[PDB]
């Protein structure tokens, strides 16, 4: 370091060797932390917070762990951001991408140790990825023209997604729920149209998907508690002090009788509005705002069930379920469409009363009731079901699938090796390192299972080299099997995203040779 | 830029000020314009902070609402009919005024500093007006060309070509704040010496 100082007190600088060491150590630590949760036989982690009043959770998803882990190493933050973006994009594969990035950087460390410039490694990895993505694209299988085969593929995808989660105890039960819930949307990618309600009590096998709809709301006093052949009006209006005439007006009189008369006209306005609402010929009124007691008694006298304070989400889901439209100003009954259902009643689940709609018209939205013995169990169940719903929606939007259980990784590795044996220079070592990094995910899967990972990977590599492009791991016995026969399926978009994101993050981290830290902002104790 | 890029403009030039929506929809070069210099605020606002309105009927309410727009549009039309093509003010120019001027191919600038406005008046030959009710020709300034240009990351308004000018402006370039400050300090020494030498030789 120069005798002259070029920094404030507390500012720090790290040059080539130290910077590479720090970045590699951070990335490898992040990868090693999450390796354990990979595969059908992965385990869970307990996350407890020191600051947020000791909140406790038990989880397996990778992005959830990495978001909560409070890293301070600059290199680890890139991997955390990559995992979060992967979760936001496809919603599955948040562990494989970070494991792949960590393994790539671990290989690059030894490659640097062998006196190779990082740019050569970067070029080799670029060519390797270019070959691997082409091989993966050529390996895809496209269905969709056949309804039976499409449903079979959807069931296989859901069952493969749920294998690594706790819901693996009831895999068929939850696979059917996921498939039906996804197919209730009639081709729309609206994931928030499915409402998951979780409540304590009962076993996880008592969860179900409702054939109608369920609201956790209440109805006004002295109103009918059940209706047959309902005609539903869904409104978004203000039936409280409704006379919010947004002008800046006031009342000035010279008597109390005049104030009484104006107060009477105030109620007359609301009575006229309620009569206009009733003119549509309804027997059920659902509002997103509050309904006060005077309109409440008007509806009760008219013999109408009124729902108050059902927020934007509930109103939109009710519209999608029943078929009506969100109305206001109530001045054209011939231009507003009403909903319809065959029965509205109240049900008791646990110790809670819920409004139940049965015999609905459209069914474009649904609710899923989750029962469990613990709040952590319910949270993990919902968090796991979200991944299945997301991947099912994605594969419905783009219906081409690729086999899993290591087969895709071995195919890409074979393509990269065939490319590497064809080129001169130091880049061949880089592509062979890329292939080695690709061939590690089946190894971790087998290791987490407790099998002879080296022997199994050798057999798989030999089979793929000889030409069995569908061979893979059989986990229920620990052997080599056919993925097409066993029904292990995956989506093509997820694998493409995993590969591309891992390559991008590895290159971004590897291009760094200097770390400069500014003086941190001091916390104020007192 | 480099030091040899420093320049002297016989006229005036000043930095771009704050602008609202629509400022990009009006032309940015004029050849023989007329310039109005104002000390009036052109935007929709309460007439006086001392005021209060008491009304009984909705028709009078609507008339009261329309009156403010009528007042503002009367001022704008009074400015427009004088023939001026460039408008400068010390007070804020509203978005309504900006869009009005842009819809008729005229340039407007607000919150111009007092010193810059005085220098512009001295260069062009007008007079600051607090009222738009007597906008005659003799109170309008004239310049032989007006432009807006990009200089080193900034936008500048240039009025050049006036032969009767009694002022000028320096544009100094350099590589650092202290570089330019020392350049200005060096220029001041020559300016004072030349003034004294003009006095006695």
């Amino acid at each position: 370091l120069a005798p002259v100082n070029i920094f404030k007190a507390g500012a720090d600088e790290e040059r080539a060797e130290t910077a590479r060491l720090t970045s590699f150590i951070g990335a490898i630590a992040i990868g090693d932390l999450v390796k354990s949760t990979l595969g059908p036989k992965g385990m869970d982690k307990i996350l407890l917070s020191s600051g947020r009043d000791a909140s406790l959770m038990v989880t397996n998803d990778g992005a959830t762990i990495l978001k909560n882990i409070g890293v301070d190493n600059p290199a680890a933050k890139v991997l955390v951001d990559m995992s979060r973006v992967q979760d936001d994009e496809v919603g599955d594969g948040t562990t494989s991408v970070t494991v792949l990035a960590a393994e790539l950087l671990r290989e690059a460390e030894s490659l640097i140790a062998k006196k190779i410039h990082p740019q050569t490694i970067i070029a080799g990895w670029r060519e390797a990825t270019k070959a691997a993505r082409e091989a993966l694209l050529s390996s895809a299988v496209d269905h969709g023209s056949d309804e039976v085969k499409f449903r079979q593929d959807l069931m296989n995808i859901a069952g493969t997604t749920l294998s690594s989660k706790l819901l693996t105890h009831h895999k068929d039960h939850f696979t059917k729920l996921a498939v039906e819930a996804v197919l209730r949307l009639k081709g729309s990618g609206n994931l928030e149209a499915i409402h998951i309600i979780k409540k304590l009590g009962g076993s996880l096998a008592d969860s179900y998907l409702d054939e109608g709809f369920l609201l956790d709301k209440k109805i006004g006093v002295n109103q009918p508690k059940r209706i047959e052949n309902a005609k539903i009006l869904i409104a978004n209006t203000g039936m409280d002090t409704d006379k919010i005439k947004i002008f800046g007006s006031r009342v000035r009189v010279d008597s109390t009788a005049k104030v009484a008369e104006i107060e009477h006209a105030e109620k007359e306005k609301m009575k006229e509005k309620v009569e206009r609402i009733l003119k549509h010929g309804i027997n059920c009124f659902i509002n997103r705002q509050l309904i006060y007691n005077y309109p409440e008694q008007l509806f009760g006298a008219a013999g109408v069930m009124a729902i108050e304070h059902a927020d934007f989400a509930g109103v939109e889901r009710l519209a999608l379920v029943t078929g009506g439209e969100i109305a206001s100003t109530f001045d054209h009954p011939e231009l507003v469409k009403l909903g319809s259902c065959k029965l509205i009643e109240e049900v008791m689940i646990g110790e809670d009363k819920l409004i139940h709609f049965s015999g609905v018209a459209l069914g474009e939205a649904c609710t899923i009731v989750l029962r469990g013995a613990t709040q952590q169990i319910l949270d993990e169940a919902e968090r796991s079901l979200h991944d299945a719903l997301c991947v099912l929606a994605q594969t419905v939007k783009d219906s081409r699938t690729v086999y899993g259980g290591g087969c895709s990784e071995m195919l890409m590795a074979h393509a990269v090796t065939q490319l590497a044996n064809r080129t001169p220079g130091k880049e061949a070592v880089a592509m062979e390192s890329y292939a080695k990094a690709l061939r590690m995910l089946p190894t971790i899967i087998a290791d987490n299972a407790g099998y002879d990972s080296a022997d199994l990977v050798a057999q798989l590599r030999a089979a793929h080299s000889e030409g069995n492009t569908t061979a893979g791991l059989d986990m229920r016995e620990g052997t080599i099997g056919d993925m097409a026969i066993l029904g292990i399926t995956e989506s093509f978009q997820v694998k493409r995203q995993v590969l591309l994101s891992a390559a991008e993050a590895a290159e971004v981290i590897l291009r760094v040779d200097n770390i400069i830290k500014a003086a941190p902002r001091k916390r104020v104790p007192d | 830029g480099a030091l040899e890029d420093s320049q002297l403009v016989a006229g005036v030039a000043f930095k771009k000020t704050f602008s609202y929506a629509g400022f990009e929809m009006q032309p940015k070069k004029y050849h023989n314009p007329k310039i109005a210099l104002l000390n009036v605020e052109l935007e929709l606002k309460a007439e006086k902070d001392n005021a209060e309105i008491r009304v009984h009927t909705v028709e009078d309410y609507q008339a009261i609402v329309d009156a403010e727009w009528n007042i503002l549009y009367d001022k704008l039309e009074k400015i427009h009919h004088s023939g001026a093509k460039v408008v400068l003010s010390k007070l804020p120019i509203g978005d309504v005024a900006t869009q009005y001027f842009a819809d008729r191919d005229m340039f407007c600038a607000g919150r111009v500093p007092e010193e810059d406005l005085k220098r512009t008046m001295m260069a062009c030959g007008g007079s600051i007006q607090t009222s738009v009710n007597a906008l005659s020709a003799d109170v309008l300034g004239r310049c032989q060309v007006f432009e807006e240009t990009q200089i080193g990351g900034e936008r500048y308004n240039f009025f050049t070509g006036c032969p009767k000018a009694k002022t000028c402006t320096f544009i100094l370039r350099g590589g650092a704040e202290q570089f330019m400050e020392e350049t200005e300090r060096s220029l001041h020494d020559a300016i004072m010496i030349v003034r004294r030498a003009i006095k006695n030789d």
Binding site: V85, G91, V251, R252, I262, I515 | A51, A176
Partner: protein, 487 residues
């Protein structure tokens, strides 16, 4: 961090934020220093960035080399004013030589090949070099679309650069329209229109309200009912006024009420709510319409035509955005950046800004030189040749300038992994033997030293700015001889 083989820096913010960058100006801006000379170098880099927009690290490298070279002359007993004068003379000679070897090429919408080559050369050093052909094409197309040619200037407020994380970097594209982060107000509105007529407004869809203090007195039931009727009559009247002009879509800068929202849905006319002023002016410029402050002033001559208005939805999030596309000849375009990392998005934005600045420089002046160190080698040869005729003790300063002007080929060769002295000695021997000033350092190892053949192109004003700015900063640094500061 110099050359196509250079590496990049990772900067940690005061709050712990991470920035991975190759831009010298941004690095020096994000570093915090105490030394006044270091702050001067930071300001020099920032001034270069503001003026030209490219070559912000070469200038600081050159200034450091020049100050280093002055040290031996200081030790030998030469007054620093003499050194400064010699530096000025050498800089003038080099600048006079520089424009003699420059070649002018072209600026037009028909060919665009030299512009593409220049943009490729400027993007060759960044992390974007995976798709640098595509991004260079995007940049040149955007600048040619926005540029004003008779006055020879561009406005960067007419180019809107936005990026959303997710997808692939290659998904980055150019839209000859507008893209905003909004959606249709009522959830049951149609999500696309194909022959949109746009009415742009700046007034809320609410009954009017005078700005001055006001009070409306209600003294009777009749007055109450009159006010009640007036409120809804206003709501109906505004919608009929908007519909009577034939418009099919409405855009407003402020919010709506529930009554207005339902009426807009009922009358088959979608609307957009709560947009910004810059977005409104961009939309007006793109669609050819005008901004109106009242419903009373709305006429069919003030609407804008758009060939497509669509709502685009991204992945598993609820985020939705609005795109306006397929307009007639437009003066506003947008760049839509995609990528897998936030820092990827940031670096892509910086690289695109560099490309746009370079193309703007080409618009301003259209004569170029060749990179790879060829211009520096030629200038050093010219200065050394001229110094042989100066007897007045300034030959030492001129030769020091010539020596310090050759640090760029050293840096390039050392970064590329070859031997600097042998490489530049051979290159200079070839240049003096033949008559090709277009010979430089073969960084990418394509087997030739001819940058004219390899299509490596740089703007002339960039080199002029670098040389002049560095020389003047070095003169300022040399002039100082005292310092006082607290402890």
């Amino acid at each position: 961090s110099l050359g196509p083989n250079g590496l990049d820096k990772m900067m940690v913010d005061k709050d712990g934020d991470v920035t991975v960058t190759n831009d010298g100006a941004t690095i020096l801006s994000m570093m915090d220093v105490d030394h006044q000379i270091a702050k001067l170098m930071v300001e020099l880099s920032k001034s270069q960035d503001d003026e030209i927009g490219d070559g912000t690290t070469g200038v600081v490298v050159l200034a450091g080399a020049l100050l280093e070279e002055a040290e031996q002359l200081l030790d030998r007993g030469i007054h620093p004013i003499r050194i400064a004068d010699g530096y000025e003379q050498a800089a003038r000679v080099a600048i006079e030589h520089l424009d003699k070897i420059s070649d002018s090429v072209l600026v037009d919408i028909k060919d665009t090949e030299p512009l593409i080559q220049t943009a490729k050369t400027t993007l060759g050093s960044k992390v974007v070099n995976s798709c640098h052909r595509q991004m260079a094409e995007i940049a040149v197309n955007a600048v040619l679309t926005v540029a004003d040619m008779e006055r020879r200037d561009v406005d960067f407020e007419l180019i809107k650069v936005e990026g959303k994380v997710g997808g692939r970097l290659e998904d980055t594209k150019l839209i000859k329209g507008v893209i905003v982060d909004k959606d249709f107000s009522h959830p049951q509105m149609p999500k696309k229109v194909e022959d949109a007529k746009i009415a742009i407004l700046t007034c809320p869809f609410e009954p009017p309200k005078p700005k001055t203090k006001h009070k409306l007195d209600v003294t009777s039931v009749e007055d109450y009912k009159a006010l009640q009727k007036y409120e809804k009559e206003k709501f109906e009247e505004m919608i009929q006024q908007i519909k009577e002009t034939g418009a099919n879509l409405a855009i407003c800068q402020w919010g709506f009420d529930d009554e207005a929202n339902h009426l807009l849905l009922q009358n088959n006319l979608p609307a957009v709510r709560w947009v910004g002023g810059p977005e409104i002016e961009l939309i007006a410029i793109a669609t050819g319409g005008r901004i109106v402050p009242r419903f009373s002033e709305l006429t069919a001559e003030k609407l804008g035509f758009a060939g497509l208005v669509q709502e685009i939805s991204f992945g598993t999030t609820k985020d939705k955005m609005l795109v306006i596309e397929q307009c007639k000849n437009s003066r506003a375009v947008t760049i839509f950046i995609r990528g897998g990392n936030k820092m990827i998005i940031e670096e892509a934005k910086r690289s695109l800004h560099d490309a746009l600045c370079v193309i703007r420089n080409l618009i301003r002046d259209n004569r170029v030189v060749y990179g790879g160190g060829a211009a520096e080698i030629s200038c050093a040869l010219a200065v050394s040749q001229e110094a042989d005729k100066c007897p007045t003790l300034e030959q030492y300063a001129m030769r020091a300038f010539a020596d310090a002007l050759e640090v760029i080929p050293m840096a390039l060769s050392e970064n590329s992994g070859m031997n600097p002295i042998q490489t530049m000695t051979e290159v200079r021997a070839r240049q003096v033997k033949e008559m090709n000033p277009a010979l430089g350092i073969d960084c990418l190892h394509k087997g030739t030293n001819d940058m004219k053949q390899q299509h490596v192109i740089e703007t002339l004003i960039g080199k002029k700015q670098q040389i002049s700015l560095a020389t003047q900063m070095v003169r300022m640094i040399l002039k100082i001889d005292d310092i006082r500061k607290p402890g």
